[PDB]
């Protein structure tokens, strides 16, 4: 992900920001959050 | 988590913010993101 990017889910509907990108995935609710 | 909170992976080194808390857990690198 790109720094300053926001990610939201479609299930849980959780929204978080990407303060610091990493070589991993942002899982959520036995799923994988979405990116805006 | 409470909005305004930031969570890290504590592994890869990914940092994100909880813009909107939901009914899900932030996972990264097969790990449960930690709270700063
Ligand atoms: Zn989710
Ligand atoms: Zn990670």
From Swiss-Prot, chains A, B:
Cofactor note: Binds 2 irons ions per subunit via 4 cysteine residues per iron.
Alphabetical list of Pfam families matching this protein: Desulfoferrod_N (PF06397)
Gene symbol of the encoding locus: dsr
SUPFAM superfamilies membership: Rubredoxin-like (SSF57802)
Name of the protein described by the UniProt record: Desulforedoxin
Binding site for Fe cation: 9, 12, 28-29
Subunit structure: Homodimer.
Alphabetical UniProt keywords: Electron transport, Iron, Metal-binding, Transport
Co-factor requirement: Fe cation
């Amino acid at each position: 992900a790109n720094e300053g990017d926001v990610y939201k889910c479609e299930l849980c509907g959780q929204v978080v920001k990407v303060l610091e990108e990493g070589g991993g995935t942002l899982v959520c609710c036995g799923e994988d959050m979405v990116k805006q």
